[PDB]
């Protein structure tokens, strides 16, 4: 398929593990919003979207409930064919050229994720970091796999060591990807 | 590893030349196997794998389900695109261009720009550098900004990095020296 | 407030 702009007005995801679900809209590969299925709230990912765009989270909850039904049927129809664990590839880089003292952001891209059950954390000098760690939703791909991006806002210093730990069922061990300056 | 059963429903819209060519494709995916899809160019549900004959034949029989999915070309694809014209298609983030010696290799770090259309050229002394210039594919930061790094093998002269972008009527010209 | 909609999903046979 060829097009100038591709829009995913309905990236509906539901998996038996959890069970967890996800509803989100994407345009040109960027997540417009996701719907927090637990709080029934639409979370737009740009300030311009929050002031001009609106979406009812009840439409998302209804589709996911249909996905829960549809999943139970294709499980029975496919003789309970479980998913295949893929090997995710991890890339770490900065958003802007790092300047000491100027706050930047580290970007941990975890690509080729399937099933959408990944556990991504940051480490500073070997210590787990639980501050400034943001995370995107599972962003769809054309081959029906997913990729997730984790962020880490930091302050550049001389003795800084940052690694992105990624834990997935397709990996034999937790994958540590060090960030080379 | 625990077993997992994944289900995906992708309601995808395709646009070309503004609103002249609009296409709707709703994909139904078990794990990573798309078994049924509805193509607005076709107009009816069709099974992609032998896992969706029961679904495609049944959804095509429900008259209102088929007609509403057909009407989603106007209620979803065409309607939401008008809101994109007010917001997404007007987003213009100017790129930040920085030249810095690598740690000889000069890099031209073009970061935080939108949309994806960009052009970067290296110039050694008003003569364009073809060989020795190594670029990266466009990088999606995930926060509606893109990034690209164009390196140049050099040996010292005023090296110049030119950048073009829709947000810029004037191309950004940065000299290293 | 007016909201945009996504693609509607159908219920399988079952």
């Amino acid at each position, epitope marked *: 398929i060829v097009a100038d702009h591709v829009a995913s007005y309905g990236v509906n995801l539901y998996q038996s593990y959890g069970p967890s679900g996800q509803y989100s809209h994407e345009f040109d590969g960027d997540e417009e919003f996701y719907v927090d299925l637990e709080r029934k709230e639409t979370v737009w990912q740009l300030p311009l979207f929050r002031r001009f765009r609106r979406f009812d989270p009840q439409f998302a909850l209804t589709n996911i409930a249909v996905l829960k039904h549809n999943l139970n049927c294709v499980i029975k129809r496919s003789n309970s064919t479980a998913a295949t664990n893929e090997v995710p590839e991890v890339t770490v880089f900065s958003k802007s050229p790092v300047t000491l003292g100027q706050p930047n952001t580290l970007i941990c891209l975890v690509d080729n994720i399937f099933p959408p059950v990944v556990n991504i954390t940051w480490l500073s000098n070997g210590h787990s970091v639980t501050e400034g760690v943001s995370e995107t939703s599972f962003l769809s791909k054309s081959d029906h796999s997913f990729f997730k991006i984790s962020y880490l806002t930091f302050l550049p210093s001389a003795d800084e060591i940052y690694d992105c730990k990624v834990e997935h069922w397709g990996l034999d061990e937790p994958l540590l990807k060090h960030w080379e300056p | 590893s625990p077993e997992d059963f994944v289900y995906q429903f992708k309601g995808m819209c395709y646009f070309t030349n503004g609103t002249e060519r609009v296409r709707l494709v709703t994909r139904y995916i078990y794990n990573r196997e798309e078994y049924a899809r509805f193509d607005s160019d076709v107009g009816v549900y069709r099974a992609v794998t032998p896992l969706g004959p029961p679904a495609a034949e049944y959804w095509n029989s429900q008259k209102e389900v088929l007609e*509403r999915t057909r009407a989603e070309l106007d209620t979803v694809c065409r309607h939401n695109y008008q809101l994109e014209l007010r917001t997404t298609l007007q987003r213009r983030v100017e790129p930040t261009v920085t030249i810095s010696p690598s740690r000889n290799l000069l890099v031209c770090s073009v970061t935080d720009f939108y949309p994806a259309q960009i052009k970067v050229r290296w110039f050694r002394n008003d003569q364009e550098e073809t060989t020795g210039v190594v670029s990266t594919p466009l990088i999606r930061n995930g926060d509606w900004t893109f990034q690209i790094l164009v390196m140049l093998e050099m040996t010292p002269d005023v090296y110049t990095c030119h950048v073009e972008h829709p947000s810029l009527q004037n191309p950004i010209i940065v000299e290293w020296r | 407030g007016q909201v945009e909609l996504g693609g509607g999903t159908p219920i399988e046979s079952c």
Partner: T-cell receptor
Amino acid sequence: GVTQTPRYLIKTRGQQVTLSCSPISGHRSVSWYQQTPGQGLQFLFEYFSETQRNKGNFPGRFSGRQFSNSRSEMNVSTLELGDSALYLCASSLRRGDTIYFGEGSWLTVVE
Amino acid sequence: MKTTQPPSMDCAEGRAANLPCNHSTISGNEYVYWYRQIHSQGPQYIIHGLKNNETNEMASLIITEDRKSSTLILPHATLRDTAVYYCIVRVAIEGSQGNLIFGKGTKLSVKP
């Protein structure tokens, strides 16, 4: 067709009333409405996949449930004289399709 | 609501009843629905459409090109067609996405 039971009810102030509704065979979305001569036909709540979706502007006294067979049961607590009305139930194949109403349950709250 | 209707409208038996309805604030993702209620019975679904003209065995729906107004055309008016006709826009609004909020409607009296 949509079926509603009971067809007529007489209750006093303070009591509670449960209203049943069997939707059209195959339908899974159920909506409840209240019709009064005063405020007209007002929306109460909508149910799909055993959970409530869209909800009207009625107090917590007006509750409801939806079972696995897509059947719904509306309940009203601490009945007032203004609660006497015709309570209509509508069903659709799914949330977002054409809703089809039943005949309703006539409730009359007496002093 | 988004719909405005004539409160009452008379019609002679056998003639065609053209029930008007205005909805200039409708959106591209909202349908026009028509319902009727005979006496204190359950509301009967008539027809619905988006932008084209629809026709079932009961009536015909004519929506303007700019979708700002519509008309329900009952060709063969019987005495059993004396009812309150509700023109409803199924809105796409937060808190009421997909709700059919009834208005005052049009009281159509088929005069024999």
